[PDB]
Structure formats: C-alpha cells, structure tokens
C-alpha cells in the first residue's frame, strides 16, 4: 500500500502535510530513482504502528527533513523529533509539479510565533500579528497572511524545483 502514497497523483502542501496510517504485511529502495533516501536508527511487521507522511517542498529545503534541523520548513511546517527512527525519501518532481508560467498550488507557512512540536500540524489562516495592535482578520502593516506559495516553473534552478517527500516513521 506504499503505492497509494508514493504514486499518488496529488500531493499535499507541506503546511497541510498528509499522514497515512499503515497496517500492512527494501522493495522501494531497489526500484528507486530517488535523490534522497536516509534512514535513522535503522538500516535496510516488526512494529506496533507505522506512518507515512507526504508533501512537496523546494530542493534546497529537503535538508531540513532531518533530526535536529532548523529553517522555515522545520520550524513552521514539518518537524522531525531528535530521536527519530524511520526513513526520509525524496525525489525531484519538476515534470509533474511545475508548469510554464508557474504552478502556485503548493504553499508553505512563512509566519509563526513559535516552532512546531515534532509531528505537529498547523493549517490555520489567521492573520499574523507582528506588532502590539490586533489585526482583526485584515491584512496590512504588521498584519501578514501566514501562507506563501511556491512558484514552480520548469526552468527554476534545482534548488527551487519541487521535490516530493515521504517520511516513514516506525513505532
């Protein structure tokens, strides 16, 4: 059933990252073409429960999907715990997730007052308050809409190209 998560036609925005509970039975790595395949605590059921998380991000941000990492993605979108045991699997998806003139469908959270706890998800769109005055739901000075969109165009440098990501966590 990893096919329904890897070969899914549509992926989630990283701020609204997707979580599939796996109740189930190295076939992934052997038929790879993956750019990132890093496992933590283990090298290639014997597990209570296993989760598959998937979303899209920039190429330069894949490094942040790792234990003890910092950045806009790790702080405000998707956080891995320090004791993480699992695998992080990523691959370039420019041919699907980029469009001429830009694909603006994939978003990320640019503003948050404090970091996310591990495996925390925040999909609120409340106006962010950068000063002492309340925003009352309206954008303006010191009152920012939290989400910002990626612009995936086919001719972006590899660091700004879309990468699909799946995170397997074992417990």
């Amino acid at each position: 059933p990893f096919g329904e998560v890897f070969n899914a036609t549509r992926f989630a925005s990283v701020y609204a990252w997707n979580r599939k509970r796996i109740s189930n039975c190295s076939v992934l790595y052997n038929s790879a073409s993956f750019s990132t395949f890093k496992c933590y605590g283990v090298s290639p059921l014997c597990f209570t429960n296993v989760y598959a998380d998937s979303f899209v991000i920039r190429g330069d941000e894949v490094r942040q999907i790792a234990p003890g990492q910092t950045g806009k993605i790790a702080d405000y979108n998707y956080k891995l715990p320090d004791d993480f045991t699992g695998c992080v699997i990523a691959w370039n998806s420019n041919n699907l997730d980029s469009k001429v003139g830009g694909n603006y469908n994939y978003l990320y959270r640019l503003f948050r007052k404090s970091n996310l706890k591990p495996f925390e998800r925040d999909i609120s769109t409340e106006i962010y308050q950068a000063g002492s005055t309340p925003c009352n739901g309206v954008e303006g000075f010191n009152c920012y809409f939290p989400l910002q969109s990626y612009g995936f165009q086919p001719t972006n440098g590899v660091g700004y190209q879309p990468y699909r990501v799946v995170v397997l966590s074992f417990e």
Partner: antibody, heavy 121, light 109 residues
Framework: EVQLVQSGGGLVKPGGSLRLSCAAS????????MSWVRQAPGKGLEWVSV???????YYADSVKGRFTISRDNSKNTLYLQMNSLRAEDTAVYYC???????????????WGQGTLVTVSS | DIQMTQSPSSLSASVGDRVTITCRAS??????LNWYQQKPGKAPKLLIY???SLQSGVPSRFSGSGSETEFTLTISSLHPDDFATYYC??????????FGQGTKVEIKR
C-alpha cells in the same frame, strides 16, 4: 512612528567583548524576523546575523561562533553579543526588522540609527 | 552563494537627469532582488523590493525592473538630495543574504 533605537557600541581591545542593544517601538521583536547588518569604514554592507521569531539563528561565516543574536520580550529589545573581537569587526552596526527578503513581513523596512564599534589596542 | 556585480561604481548627473544603475547576478535569481539607498554614515533605506515593487514611502521617481540575471534601478528625475551610494541585494541564496558593492551618485552642476 515605528522606530528602532540602538545603544551600546564603543571601543574594545582585540579579544574583548561588547553587547549591542536595539530597543523597538511599534514592532514586537519576539514576533518578527530580526537582523543585524554592519559596514566597515569605507566598505560595503554585510549581513551579520538573522533571528526567527521561533528562535532559529543564522550568521555570516566571518562571525560564526563569535557572535550571538538574542532578544528580550519584556524590554522589547534585540541584542547582539560580540566576543573575540578583532580589527576586521571595526564597523558601524545596524539593527533591522526582516531578514533581507522580498515579501512584506520579511523585507527589511525599518532600521536603527547605527552604532560605531571600534576594535583597537 | 551568488555574487552581485553592480555597474557603474561611480556616476555624476545634474538635477533633473535620468539615472540608471545596473546589478548583475552570476546566476539566475528570478525576481529575488532589493535596492537600498544609503547616505554616508546613516542607515540604509529600502527603495525597491522583489525587483520592481515600490516600498511604501519612497518617492515615485524610483523604479526597478529586471529578472533572472540583469536588474536596473531608475531615478526618473534626479533631485539634489538624491546623492548617496545605492546598493542591490539578492534574496535567493542561503541566509544571510549578500549585497552588491555599491554605486555612488554625485550631483553635477
């Protein structure tokens, strides 16, 4: 009026330390990307450090390990701790909101007046 | 890390003149570019952000344009106080971002 009022530069010997202050008004420092930028005498601008509202910090290679960006919410102030100072660090230092980005919120729109830091024997 | 080359380094022009300053990126950076003005020992002023957006406040005679690797800052009609050093700054690389080396503007008379 949103303002950033700086304080606390001065003279210091190579190896010594110094803390820069930036008291803000109209902006919540703990809620914002904040930045320190500097200019050596007769040179260009150099981004020194950035801090995220969540707490993540970033530094130019030339000051990594020796500098520390910090803040205090109850005094709404941004700080730069400078240790192991050297002649190259002789500059005028500026605090600013934002991180140098190009989206409102992360753009560097307001700045402090600057403070001179002189590292000399 | 990206490296920005401005041109020219120095530049003289009369009150009312059109003025143009170019900033060149060593690789393509989309529209991730900003322009600042700085009087000698004073704080930088943000003029243009995202290559072409006029920062609130800044007089309308300032305008920016460009994309990928070539960017221009344009003063449509020079005022006598506009003398300063003008910097560009890419916002494409890893933090902390980097600047161009600066273009100094003097008033001719």
């Amino acid at each position: 009026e949103v303002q950033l009022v700086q304080s606390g530069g001065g003279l210091v010997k190579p190896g010594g330390s110094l803390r820069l202050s930036c008291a803000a008004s109209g902006i919540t420092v703990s809620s914002n990307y904040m930045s320190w930028v500097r200019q050596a005498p007769g040179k260009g601008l150099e981004w020194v450090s950035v801090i995220y509202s969540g707490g993540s910090t970033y530094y130019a290679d030339s000051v990594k390990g020796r500098f520390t960006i910090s803040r205090d919410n109850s005094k709404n102030t941004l700080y730069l701790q400078m240790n192991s100072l050297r002649a190259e660090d002789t500059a005028v230092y500026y605090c600013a909101r934002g991180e140098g980005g190009s989206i409102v919120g992360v753009t560097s729109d307001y700045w402090g007046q600057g403070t001179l830091v002189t590292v000399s024997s | 890390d990206i490296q920005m080359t401005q041109s020219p380094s120095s530049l003289s022009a009369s009150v009312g003149d059109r003025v143009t300053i170019t900033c060149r990126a060593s690789q393509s950076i989309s529209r991730y570019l900003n322009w600042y003005q700085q009087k000698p020992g004073k704080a930088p002023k943000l003029l243009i952000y995202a290559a072409s957006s006029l920062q609130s406040g800044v007089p309308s005679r300032f305008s920016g344009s460009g994309s990928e690797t070539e960017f221009t800052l344009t003063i449509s009609s020079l005022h006598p106080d506009d003398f300063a050093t003008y910097y560009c700054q890419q916002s494409y690389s890893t933090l902390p971002y980097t600047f161009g080396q600066g273009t100094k503007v003097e008033i001719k008379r």
